[PDB]
């Protein structure tokens, strides 16, 4: 495709900071949702495995 032209509109400095902050907040939020559950809380699964 010709997706390389997105950088002709977006500033590379702005996207990378936004992309970096958005991805970490996503990863932290998704990880917390897993911790909320009882089936995917790996900390609780280890306790239940002993």
């Amino acid at each position: 495709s010709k997706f390389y032209k997105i950088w002709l509109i977006f500033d590379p400095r702005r996207v990378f900071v936004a992309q970096g902050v958005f991805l970490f907040l996503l990863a932290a939020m998704i990880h917390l949702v897993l911790l909320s559950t009882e089936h995917f809380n790996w900390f609780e699964l280890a306790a239940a495995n002993a």
Partner: protein
């Protein structure tokens, strides 16, 4: 009577003031969109000038919306997506903190799990806004008193929802995200731990809260009283003291025996306001983690008043007498 400078009696509007600039190049991130409101211009400046939007500002605005939306989406889902009921119960609904049975662990999404996630975005949003205040002061080449004063407010903000729950070992100690519920939490917090009136730091914070309103009524009235001498231009009165600073000082010197300077008034102003959450943060941090009962603490330290009169209503009147029969 004489013109009390409370509302401007004539407004002048010229070209919009886009703001000062230096080598830090503030104008890159400014919106360059201005509007003038003549209604707000009666009491203050009428220009709704451009706002510097950086990355701390955008991240704070975006993450603050996520906390606002997550709380709002939960509240809307709490009433079964009934918009009329959501509006009716808007002041009553909240995002309640996790149940105490979960301690500091991550609770289920319906039992405070979304509260932690919403709190996480709120914490990032508040800190980002503080960084914006710090960065803007540094890029404006001024002092960081705005950021430092904000950090004092964040101190109570962090203690209420982040530091004390960690020290208490339970996320349930946080404050619910509701209009009335954080008032219920405020009342329940005082009742649970004795009487927060007898917390010395709560009393100390009230001293500076009362002093802040007392000073800023005094400073506002004094400046408006000497605004006929250009007292509202305080900065020029600091670098070159005029009669506005002299009469303002002499008014308070002749009234209560001592006064301040045009610059020293704001040091009193800054510190009294800053000490309001600083003492409150200490008082809340010492509540539960140390004391757990403040009136008994007052009795132990001998500053709780003792009353000798009787307590029942029968000791003062009769039920029939009160009813007038």
């Amino acid at each position: 009577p004489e013109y009390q400078n409370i509302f401007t009696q004539v407004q002048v509007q010229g070209p919009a003031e886009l703001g000062v600039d230096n080598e830090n190049n503030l104008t890159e991130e400014r919106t360059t969109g201005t509007g003038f409101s003549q209604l707000i211009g009666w009491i203050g400046n009428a220009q709704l000038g451009p706002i510097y939007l950086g990355w701390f500002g955008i991240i704070s605005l975006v993450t603050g919306t996520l906390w606002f939306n997550i709380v709002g989406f939960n509240m809307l889902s709490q009433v079964g997506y009934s918009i009329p009921e959501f509006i009716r119960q808007l002041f009553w609904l909240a995002l309640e903190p996790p149940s105490p049975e979960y301690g500091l662990r991550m609770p289920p999404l319906d039992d405070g799990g979304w509260f932690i996630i919403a709190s996480f975005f709120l914490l990032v949003s508040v800190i980002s806004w503080w960084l914006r205040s710090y960065q803007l002061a540094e890029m404006h080449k001024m002092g960081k008193h705005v950021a430092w004063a904000f950090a004092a407010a964040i101190w109570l903000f962090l203690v209420l929802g982040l530091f004390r729950p960690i020290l208490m070992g339970s996320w349930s100690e946080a404050v619910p995200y509701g209009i009335f519920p954080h008032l219920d939490w405020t009342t329940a917090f005082s009742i649970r731990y004795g009487n927060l009136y007898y917390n010395p730091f709560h009393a100390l914070s009230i001293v500076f809260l009362y002093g802040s309103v007392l000073l800023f009524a005094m400073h506002g009235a004094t400046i408006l009283a000497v605004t006929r001498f250009g007292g509202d231009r305080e900065l020029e009165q600091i670098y070159d003291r005029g009669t506005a600073s002299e009469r303002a000082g002499l008014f308070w010197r002749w009234t209560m025996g001592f006064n301040a300077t045009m610059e020293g008034i704001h040091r009193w102003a800054w510190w009294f306001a800053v000490l309001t959450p600083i003492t409150g943060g200490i008082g809340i941090l010492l509540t539960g983690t140390v004391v757990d009962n403040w009136f008994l603490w007052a009795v132990e330290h001998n500053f709780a008043p003792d009353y000798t009169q009787d307590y029942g209503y029968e000791a003062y009147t009769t039920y029939d007498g009160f009813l007038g029969r």
